[PDB]
Structure 1
Amino acid sequence: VYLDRKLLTLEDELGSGTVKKGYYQMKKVVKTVAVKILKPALKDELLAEANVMQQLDNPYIVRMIGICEAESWMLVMEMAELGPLNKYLQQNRHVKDKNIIELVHQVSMGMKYLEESNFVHRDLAARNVLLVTQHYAKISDFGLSKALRADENYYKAKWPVKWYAPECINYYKFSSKSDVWSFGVLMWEAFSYGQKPYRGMKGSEVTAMLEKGERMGCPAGCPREMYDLMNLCWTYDVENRPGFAAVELRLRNYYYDVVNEGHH
C-alpha cells in the first residue's frame, strides 16, 4: 500500500490532476504502472479511491499497486497499454462485433463481482474501461465508487449525467441497478465504436427524452440481441431492471452463441 518513491520512475502524460505512465521496481521485476497524480478534499478522495481498489480482487478490475506521497499525492496502479475502450474503438474501426461482445461481457463479469461485493461504481463508462489487450478489458476509475452500508442497497449522494439512471437524477440514489443503467450506455458506446451517447443533447434534454420512454437507437452493425440487452439495462423502474448476475449471464450465453457460429 505504501510505496518507496525512489523505486518509481515517471515519464515526462497519458491524460489531463494528471495520469502518467511509470515504472515501479518490484520484488524482482520492474513493473510498468499508471500513476494518477494530483494538482484537502482532493487528497482524501485519492485515499478513498485507494481504499476501494484495495478491497477488490478480480481479473476484470484494474489493480492498485499502492499510494505515494512526494511532489504530489500519487496513486499507482497496473498499466493498461491499449488504454480507454472508447478511444481504442475510435481509432480501430474494424474491430469485429464478436470482439466487442467479448469485451463488454468481460466488463459485465467485473461488474457482477462489484455487485456481489456490494460496491457501486458510479462512473461506469467506456472511457473507464481500459484495454490490457484487444481481448482483455478491465474496469478503472473508482474515484466515485462507494461501499454500500450493511443495511442499505443504495448510496445517497459534476455528474456524468448521460450515464446515470433516472433514480440517480431524481432521488440521488445509487445502487448496482444504477450501475446496470450505466452499463447499457457503455454497451451503446462500445457498439457505436466509441462515439458519445446522446450526441448534441444537453443533460436536461436527456432526462426529458428518457421520461418520454425514448431510448438511444441501435448502433450500425449491432446485433439485435445486444440492443435488446441495452434496452433492458435501460429499464426505468429499478426493481424490474436486471442485476449484473442476469446481465453477465445474458452476455455469457450470447458470446458463446456467436463463438459457435464463427466455427459453423
Structure 2
Amino acid sequence: YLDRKLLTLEDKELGSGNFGTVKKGYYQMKKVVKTVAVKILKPALKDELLAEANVMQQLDNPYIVRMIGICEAESWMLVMEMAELGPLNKYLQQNRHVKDKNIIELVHQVSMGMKYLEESNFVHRDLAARNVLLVTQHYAKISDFGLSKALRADENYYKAQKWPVKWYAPECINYYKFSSKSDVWSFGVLMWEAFSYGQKPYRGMKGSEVTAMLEKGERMGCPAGCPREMYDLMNLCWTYDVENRPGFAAVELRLRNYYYDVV
C-alpha cells in the first residue's frame, strides 16, 4: 500500500478501457522519483485489481512489468513502472519499418518472460500483443495480469467456471482448462500479430468461425516478410493437442537460437 501523498498523477489519460483509465504519474522514492503508469478503476472490479496486484507482487523478471504497489484513494489504483513506448501492437502499427530482426528480438524477450512465468507456475490467460509493453524499441515487458492465475500445487492447469477467444487454445474453449501450454498457443498468435505489425488476428471472423477454422486444421497464413523458421514456430505453438504442444522452455530456446543466427 502506497502513500497517496508520494504519488503525483498527470491530468490527461494515456488510455481508457472498460476497467477505467491508465494515467502517467510519479512516485517519490527515497531520493529519486520514479515515472509510473497507473491503472485507475471506474464490487468485482476492486477484487480483480487486488488479485492482479497480488500476482504481480510475486513476479520478479526483467521481461515482466514491475508493480510498485496499490493505492486506495479517490479511486483504487495499481501503480506500475512505466513502459514509455506503450503497447506493442499500436507501436508496430505506427512504426511499420521496424526490422524483422528487431521483431524477433522482442518476441524472444516475451518468450523469456513466459519461460519464467511457466517456471513460477502462473498462467497468464491473456497473452496478446496489446499486453506486451515496450520500454524501448529493443526491450519488451509482459503486462496485464488481470486474468492470471497461480496454479494449485497439485495441478498443472486452472479450470475456469468475455474471453479473448482468438488467442485461446482449443482445450481452453472446449474444456475450460488453462495451462502454460495454453499460454504457448496464445504466444503463437502474439508472434503472428508482431510479424504482422499489429494487425488483428483472424480478421473479419467471428469467434465461432475461428473455432470452425481451427477444427478443420487450418491456421493463419505466414505474414509478409516473416521468416519461414518463425512461421514454423508459430505453427508448432498452434499444435491442437496440448500434450504434444511445446512448453516455453522449448519455445524460448528455438527463438534464442534463431535470433543469434540472424544476429
State if a TM-score over 0.5 links the two structures: yes
Q: CA RMSD in A?
A: 0.4
Return the alpha-carbon distance in structure 2 between the equivalents of residues 161 and 14 of structure 1: 26
Deviation, 1:14, is 1.1
Deviations 1:136-191 (A, max 9, x none): 00000000000000000000010000000000000000000000000000000000
Partner of 2:122: 119
Q: Percent identity?
A: 100
Deviation, 1:32, is 0.3
Return the alpha-carbon distance in structure 2 between the equivalents of residues 208 and 14 of structure 1: 37
What are structure 1's unaligned runs of at least 5 residues?
A: 260-264
Deviation, 1:27, is 1.4
Deviation, 1:15, is 1.1
Deviation, 1:246, is 0.2
Deviation, 1:236, is 0.1
Deviations 1:205-236 (A, max 9, x none): 00000000000000000000000000000000
SS in 1 for 2:15: coil
Deviations 1:52-95 (A, max 9, x none): 00100100000000000011000000000000000000000000
SS in 1 for 2:243: coil
Deviation, 1:6, is 1.1
Return the alpha-carbon distance in structure 2 between the equivalents of residues 154 and 119 of structure 1: 9
Task: List, as ranges, runs of 4+ consecutive aligned residues in structure 1 with deviation greater than 4 Å.
Answer: none
Return the alpha-carbon distance in structure 2 between the equivalents of residues 52 and 65 of structure 1: 13
TM-score, scaled to structure 2: 0.98
SS in 1 for 2:77: strand
Deviation, 1:34, is 0.3
What are structure 2's unaligned runs of at least 5 residues?
A: none
TM-score, scaled to structure 1: 0.97
Deviation, 1:131, is 0.2
Deviation, 1:24, is 0.5
SS in 1 for 2:102: helix
How many residues are treated as equivalent by the alignment? 258
